[PDB]
Symmetry: C3
Amino acid sequence: GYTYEDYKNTAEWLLSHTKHRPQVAIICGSGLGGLTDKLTQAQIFDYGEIPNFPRSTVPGHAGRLVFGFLNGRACVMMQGRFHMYEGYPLWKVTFPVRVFHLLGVDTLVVTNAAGGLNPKFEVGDIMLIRDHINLPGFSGQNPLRGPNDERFGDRFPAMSDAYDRTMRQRALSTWKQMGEQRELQEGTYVMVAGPSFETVAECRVLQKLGADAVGMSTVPEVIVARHCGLRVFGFSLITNKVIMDYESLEKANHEEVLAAGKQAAQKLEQFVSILMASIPL
Amino acid sequence: GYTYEDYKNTAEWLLSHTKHRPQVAIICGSGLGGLTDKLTQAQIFDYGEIPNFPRSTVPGHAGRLVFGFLNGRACVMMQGRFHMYEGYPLWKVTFPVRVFHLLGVDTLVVTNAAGGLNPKFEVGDIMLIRDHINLPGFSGQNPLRGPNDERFGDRFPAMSDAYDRTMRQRALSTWKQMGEQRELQEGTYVMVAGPSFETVAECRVLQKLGADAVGMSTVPEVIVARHCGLRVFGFSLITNKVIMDYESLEKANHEEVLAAGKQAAQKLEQFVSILMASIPL
Amino acid sequence: GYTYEDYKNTAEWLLSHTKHRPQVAIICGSGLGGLTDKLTQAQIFDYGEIPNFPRSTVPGHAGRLVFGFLNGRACVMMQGRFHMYEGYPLWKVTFPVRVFHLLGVDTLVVTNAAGGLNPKFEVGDIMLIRDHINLPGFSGQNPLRGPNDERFGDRFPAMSDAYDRTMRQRALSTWKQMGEQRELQEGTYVMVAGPSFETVAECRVLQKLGADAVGMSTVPEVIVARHCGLRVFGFSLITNKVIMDYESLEKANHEEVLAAGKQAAQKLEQFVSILMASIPL
Ligand SMILES: O=c1[nH]cnc2c(Sc3cccc(Oc4c(F)c(F)c(F)c(F)c4F)c3/C=C/P(=O)(O)O)c[nH]c12
Ligand SMILES: O=c1[nH]cnc2c(Sc3cccc(Oc4c(F)c(F)c(F)c(F)c4F)c3/C=C/P(=O)(O)O)c[nH]c12
Ligand SMILES: O=c1[nH]cnc2c(Sc3cccc(Oc4c(F)c(F)c(F)c(F)c4F)c3/C=C/P(=O)(O)O)c[nH]c12
Ligand code: NA
Ligand code: NA
Ligand code: NA
């Protein structure tokens, strides 16, 4: 739906309107977006102001790019992200990631909320993403579907190495270098489209396929980032333990997700700020 | 594709054209639709007569709403239902369920044919639906995809409690209260899009994911029903045992499905009639 | 997107423009398409020249039908095939198969490249397709989706018998009747949409579902072939072993796929030429 010149046009317009030249793109998950308050020399653009940039549908909170410095790194932050369940085609969801590349961004940090499928996980845990299962991708919902532009990347990119080995180590280390009672989790994120929450039978399916966490975002952005050669790091805030048996009378709800998001707020701003120092130049 | 005012407009037109005020919506599976003959004060509307109502594609049998009384309950019955495989988007397939809600319907009974994946199941068995696996949903084929209307329900409804506990018990009981040689089955229904029948490798996949029965309907209607707060009960007529090995020279066919449907006809009209008395007011 | 008269119009135009009356359709996988050089009385049509025929997107190699004789059989060969990942809807991908039927073709041979999921498989192996797993099909990406035309086939065709028993035997035999050090493999092909290569977690999923090989084609053509009653035989050239662990520093690439394709070239031209003699009349 976008031409190469649409991305270039959007990129140049952003370059013309900020002296900020970002290196790291950060995509904040639902209610982990207070992290814009830690930026310095913060310059804000509402999505509506940016050519070709999809406008958000959520009336409560309209999204924005915030350019700034986080702990030494020249950052662009996406507050309010796009999801399949809102009805965006994946070429709109992942439109920002290609703009970031053309701004000169070389690293993407992606964060999300997720339900715990791994029994060991607890509400409030952070799981680093070692790998993903792209269920939409298997069926044709891949953001690379359509003509490939060699200026962005190959027709057939690999994803076996999607989540940077170096950054995962340098994040386990960084987590030791704090006084955290609870250990830092690591695992496979499965993307489902949503927006409804899984049945018990569905949760059992996702456990058997070997997923540790389930969410409704991230994987499309990761594929497009890797397609054009960005280094990728990400993690999940476990907001809830997915109901895996028919005895329980507890039900997943977005209130849970927000609540866990407010509790983990300070911890996450800290973790992501310190991590900037571990990203090369 | 529909606005809130399209559903309201359709609802009011139906209210203006019948004195019937239904409480229970019943969606009859392929050849379980003789059950309209058990209604009293039956008033029939062809889909074509009803504003905004998708017309059926099947030339042989065009669908209709029948309003009437079944065993004390004010019912609306859907004879002829929509399937993904016919090329309807899921917002058309599940358009009726939202109209039912606005008519004042508070309960949905959904019935379907299905192939047996559980080896214990036999042709002619009835399986109550305890749970579903929404394979289309994982990939983006969820009827809630798009802008959410708070007047219908939440952005992120749970489905872990989709199939009413009370009604499943009150249906096992009701089945005892008859002279049935064969025991009443209970299990997970997996929706696939069809319209072609599964390979042996596919059948093995669906067994490993933990499905008991496989069909091509129902799950989208259930999600939209739950989204706007209807109580949901359903079951499958097992029409065939899915070929699970390469030795067999038997092939699934729609003739099997119809045939099993004619045999189970009297049993199903009876079962669903008696069940009306167990639905609250 | 096509009417019955579009296929008939394309068929008749091909009949009007060649005296060749083909019996066997062959769809050549990526770089197994030198096999057009073994035809005799070869008559070539570029896709662009053929009414209603999708034009290829690949600038390097534009596709063509080659009518000719291979080892006694009146053949039509498709060099350059369509894939979901290029953005074709499945009714375009499988448009040729319906034209073949109306030309009088009664047999389809389909070949593809694939990644090895079965640990026993080695780069350069040939796997006969006993069965498939249609992951896109489960979610709604089935080329039969939409109104069914009884002139092509049934609304609800079976696929449990998709890959001809007789031809698989007559191909194992044919392989003995050569001096091949390496044994001929047999297994389940899983179709995924691509075009990106699987993660380790994804590879593990496809192993657990019981797939031996993974590719991005073939299954839609097979379904439409069976729908209109063609006999179907096919195999995969194993071009690579899918990365199934996080230790490895090897990554799948399309260069691997091409390379394996050049090595297996002579072996495959031979195998498919000899197989013609085993196809009835
Ligand atoms: O058990 C589970 N199954 C499947 N998925 C999940 C998720 S993810 C998720 C679920 C519901 C709402 C969510 O977020 C919003 C929001 F997007 C809203 F717009 C909103 F208004 C809100 F209140 C939310 F909670 C998110 C986050 C989305 P992210 O962008 O971080 O990937 C958490 N738990 C589960
Ligand atoms: O092994 C199996 N695999 C996968 N699916 C199944 C089903 S479901 C199904 C399969 C073929 C035709 C069917 O029904 C029609 C019809 F819809 C027709 F229009 C028609 F003309 C006819 F003859 C049928 F049998 C249905 C019912 C559909 P329902 O609405 O009850 O959910 C039964 N067995 C299997
Ligand atoms: O581990 C794996 N995972 C998933 N899939 C595979 C495949 S299939 C495949 C992967 C990449 C490119 C491919 O082929 C082209 C091409 F289609 C091109 F257009 C091209 F230019 C080229 F260089 C190729 F290699 C094909 C063949 C396609 P076929 O039509 O034979 O089914 C091989 N290995 C794996
Ligand atoms: Na351009
Ligand atoms: Na309106
Ligand atoms: Na016509």
